């Protein structure tokens, strides 16, 4: 067929110029991370999450007054935790406990 | 749009207005030759016929340029474009030149190829300091590389592993005499950053010059006569007087070196090879009290580490990197401040070819046995590495049972790491002293290290001994798994062998934890080359563009563009830093001794 | 064979844009299409040559040695220039409306005439002097010549302007400022107030900052 | 009254441009020489006509 | 008890006289505004008799000339 | 119009292809291509008709 | 033509010396690549020197020496197989120079090193440009050899000529090899004039003068710098001066 | 890429003594004695018999002008 | 031959030579005693005047360009050094290339201040009296006199822990434990092992807000003067130096025992407010000199004294880029090609502004010879011009 | 001993595919290997048998390639000793005329 | 090859190092020089995905 057997293969021939995908290294989807301490504020915990496309940072930070920020993707404006955590699915303070 | 057309790191102040693309240039690779003078350059013969100067025939080159236009643009003395006084250029290529080689009508302007003598420039492109553009003096040789004399390669900061240098001819007759008078190589032999010489000797020129002035360098009659013809100089039949006829009528090594110096030098200084300061002292003591002794009797108590020249005759010494060199050499230094400049371009042109002759026909190989230590010296090393690891294992036990002995500044975790590295350092320095003491100064691997030409005394004892510890920006190696760097070590361990410390040479083989520890320390060196270069480039643009306005007026005053006086009597008046000596001024001390000697000696 | 001595900057008057320009462009069309690139508008309506056709504004002028020429657009609505907008805001909140004064006492008129010639050399020292004039004119609401005619509070961030005016007793409605309302106010400032700011009465009129006529760049700058 | 290095490189530059545009040469002849090198030889014998102005 | 002087960093200042202003001005052919302007703050000038609009001479030392003068002005 | 030159076409055959093993050098052509008019009526710059 | 080892000793062919002038050895050996001795105990490349003996042992014995990492052929077994095949234990041999011919009083090291040629060859680097095709918009040269263009002279190269003192050369390089244009400019308006051929007479639009008008000689990139400031509402009043 | 008909340092022909060499090394005989049995004396002749590829078989079969 | 003969031969000759030169030349001639007599004395002075006359700067030089290149070349070869220095006192003072940027750009903050403290003539040799000076300089709060916090049950709310040796090895004076009541709020009094148990026995004003007292007296304790960082003592030149941390000048100089006249500092903006501008001239000069010598490679101090005497040009020190000397007074076109911001800056001088000439970036922009270098000389020549 | 949990295979395969071309790579320095493993990716050499019937934009071919002498045992079992790249010179170490 | 998505120019001193998990998966030596110098890295010769 006009080849040599030592060629390993693994490359497309789109348009007549042999093109290869080079593997991009992710940062472990659907995990959770415990970020380090004492660069400007207290400890934070950043994460990534994507399904069918769009990926976004969803962090739960806290600085030295007990704000406990939560980050939203769209329209950033960092929101307090007990604003979001009450408004999401739980109303009773006993339910936040459990 | 307009704001992106005006600006944007390549807009129309820096990209196209104050920096433009040019004409009449070339760019190729470089390759050495130490046979041309210090201020010449090779030009390939293809590039020489595609760059042209304008010539404007007056009255006394009219016989020359009749021949340059009769010859066509093929044979190397030739022309390309002739110009009438109207302005209509006439290309020469097509089918006849005899009808253009008629009455040539004084006033025309002919463009001919470069010849031996036309001033060019040169460039390296990263253009850091003031001196990386320097007008050379074209010489034409057939191949495809720019050639370049070996001593002129610390200004350009180049080497010869396929780099790229670009020349560009200047054309108009006012812009050409500025290049020849103000920018030639010999005006730039000393540097304005520290005064010391910059264009000087390199790798072979130093370690060849040590083999000429060793005690025991006796050349025969044929070897003297051959090398004086090869190093340029022209002397008649006076190599005299055949100093040791015991075997055969053969000379010494000092008197072949004492033909290059002018006739009334007087210098005495101490250099790097001094291993016994007492036998220099004695020589010095006689000199200071009895200013002019006799060169025969007392002076044959000499050493090989005290240079002493009088009346252009080196009685006692040994030439190393204190007489040339990219850093301070005070024998090229005292020859540019006393005997013009044009003398010191032919001192450095005759030294260079004399020194490479003797290093060629005497051999300077370096095989594998030069790094070798005998058995009893190796067991001296291994008892050092054993007890130094045991001292580390004891100091961990003091921290583990609560016998902290703390330092005031650091915390207990940080005191432990502090103390350990000092022990490890000392261990590697103590074993470096063992090897240095043993192997003699007679192999061709310490000759390159004592004098100094691409060597240290670190990497010849980092090749038959330890390699020390292996750190990364001051910390000891800690990145890895949860409490263990590699997965071959029991966790919870702070021992020397288990946290980045190699113990084998580059001859006795690295085992795979030590080799993998060495790649960690090696990648830290390669990142900091490409990072640090980009920060210095932007930091230079601030300082040039803030300070490029300042001149020096005739009454000695540095002034801004608004007329506000910035500094009276330039630079704490008033001596040029290119010609001051080591911060100071007129140098009375050397002057007194020099003038007295000449007068008294006569 | 002269040389340039000095370059003096300023602002183009809209009167001078018409006299400099050779044509008005009214045809929103470039080529239409793939043949005969000639219009009565943006291409060579005696405006500039890029082709090998000798038709120019009566001056021959083939593409070698042809300076391009400027066109103009009679904009139907007044238009704020972008670069001045931070500094138009410095003018509007520091002037007494409907008359044209400066909201200062007679002491500072006679003092700051005299302070100009004392600091008449250095650039950095007179640049701080023009900020404090903006400071003192802000915190006043009573002018000596109009009896405090209900000064509104100006606004910015980024480009759209407003005012905080009261109508019945204390309302805080955000009346949007019109660009036609601004340029009518700027013409009422007399020329004597321009030395009190950093302006010049022959080279930089403030009412010329609002683009009533937009000039068109030449053909030789648009290949 | 010794010249500096900036004035010596301008006097040569102006004299090499006159020597190409006419301006008959002194005894400088032999056999072929570029007009810049004619200005160096005339400057060696100290017969330059051009003098400097010293602003003070 | 100490002052700003008697220190290895601060060179000593002194305020000139009326006849010395024109004598300094004709040697250097300058105008009075073309001099580098101490502010009326910064305690070196305040313990002397600082008047704005005056020339003040300093006597600083350099290790490569000896002693070296450097004239300045006073602006508020 | 747009002739590159002459005596650069000494290596082409009739149809426009270089017959192999010929010392092509410099700016010698490889395939002789004719293009079609390309807007006979766009400019009419006094001689293009 | 750049050669290199696989240890990292890159370099360029110095010259091309004939076979007759070669320092040769007390056998039929005439070396090819005479490497500089000042680079081995400065760059710490001891693997060069083990491989150079390992070529001489494995060429006389017959079998290609295994040389893999960490489990390969050891150091001491080579220098004994060389010592029993007829040569000195460290490579060193007696060598005669080819120009004059006498034993060099040292014992010159010699081996077999596998080099490899690289494609930074000189015929893909060398180019010269006298005067080529330029940009349409600026009349400046192009970029790349595939579009026939030269070098570019940044802001570094302007400052390395002011450090010398060159003011004549700095003009001649940057503008004479560029666009120069002659422009008619009015006097009392400061704005540019407008010529009009077929009817001679030149006139400044702004205030309509007839003869009081002059000529200013300036670059074209400065003339385009005026127009990008002229499109924006800035007026560049020129107030020219005699020489 | 057929064997070079000279050496590269020592001018001496070798291509006549390669196909006789290789047919006697695929019987198990040691090459240290085979190259000595022929006329190969130095080790500049011998580094270019003992390391070669003779890859002419693969390229030839493809058949294209 | 004697003193008078030389001194008055140098005094007469003096006028072309310099003042520094005079002292130097005399003190060596007199010193040398194998002595030369009369005629060679005149030969030495008439040779010394020729080298001074040879080594003056040529008028027209381009000082400002060769200052910026010879200070910006060694920053590319500005590699790492021995971060494992074998000292104790000086610790983590940001060695290297980021120091050179921090001294050129003004930057009010600068990281790692280390102020050198010298001792006077009565606290010079005394070992233990040097310790009590370090007591007075250091200063400690209550939060760093602990190691962690364990909560109590009801009202004690806090506890102090390991270790107590910060008051028995340095001597931070247990009499100050009694002193704690100074202007405080509640101030309970219970000292068993010398540490004060602080109860807060009240109500609705204080309910559970422990955190607001953590910024008051619990943190407001100042057990010693000059409320700044840590102190280390080194032996240098038979005097003890106290290389402390931080920078609190006008408080530190008013301490009984520090020699006030010699304490140099690693901060820039504070030495201008306290010691004056011309002291901050020498702060910039002496600091770049100490960085170059640590890396082996030398730069001449004519280039440093051109930058430092240009960065203090208007009585307050300026930065070098985009807010300082380039952004300060020049031609208005000179500010166009630097600080790519230009619609901020080029449209600012669109209003009422002229621009003459006489930069270096302008004459290159328009096609004129620049003023530096060879475009500074002016020729003149008459015209019979006979060949002869 | 009776303490371990696994056992390595051959450890001469830590490094990559163009870093297993350098013979004795445990004796050299570390930055010299990085240049050495960056030039096995650039040498000339006969790589494939189908260089004749192929249209690639620029190719190279070296007339007499040679299988190296002393090398790793990995490069026999990847194929490099069947399509090799480079020749075997015979060097000497001495300083010639400059 | 195994590349890593970051910025090529700004320094990442903690993302251009050589970590203990790279043993036997990523080659310690192969890294092209330039501004990258440790953002493109090659798989080892004994690994599996
Ligand atoms: Mg290079
Ligand atoms: Zn026109
Ligand atoms: Zn009013
Ligand atoms: Zn007019
Ligand atoms: Zn051979």
Numbering used by the authors:
A (entry chain B): 148 to 245
B (entry chain A): 303 to 904
C (entry chain A): 5 to 227
D (entry chain K): 2 to 57
E (entry chain H): 6 to 81
F (entry chain B): 783 to 831
G (entry chain B): 880 to 1122
H (entry chain N): 1 to 65
Sentences from the paper on this structure:
For promoter-specific transcription, RNAP and general transcription factors (GTFs) are recruited to the promoter DNA to form the pre−initiation complex (PIC). In this study, we determined the X-ray structure of TFEα and the cryo-EM structures of three forms of archaeal RNAP, including the apo-form, RNAP–TFEα binary complex, and RNAP–TFEα–DNA ternary complex. The structures reveal that direct binding of TFEα can shift the clamp conformation from a closed conformation to an open conformation. Our results support the universally conserved mechanisms of transcription initiation in all three domains of life by showing that direct binding of TFEα, a conserved GTF in archaeal-eukaryal RNAP systems, can open the clamp of the stalk-containing RNAPs.
To resolve accurate structural changes of Tko RNAP in solution through interactions with TFEα and promoter DNA, we determined the cryo-EM structure of Tko apo-RNAP. Three-dimensional classification of the apo-RNAP dataset showed that 82% particles formed complete apo-RNAP structures whereas 18% particles formed a stalkless RNAP structure. The class of apo-RNAP comprising 56%, which we refer to as a major class of apo-RNAP, was further refined and the resulting map showed a well-resolved core and structural periphery. We discovered that the cryo-EM structure of apo-RNAP adopts a closed clamp conformation. Another 3D class covering 22%, referred as a minor class, was also refined and the resulting structure was similar with the major class structure with 3.3° shift in clamp conformation to the open direction compared to the major class structure, indicating that there is a slight mobility in the clamp of apo-RNAP. In this model, the clamp of apo-RNAP is closed conformation with a slight mobility.
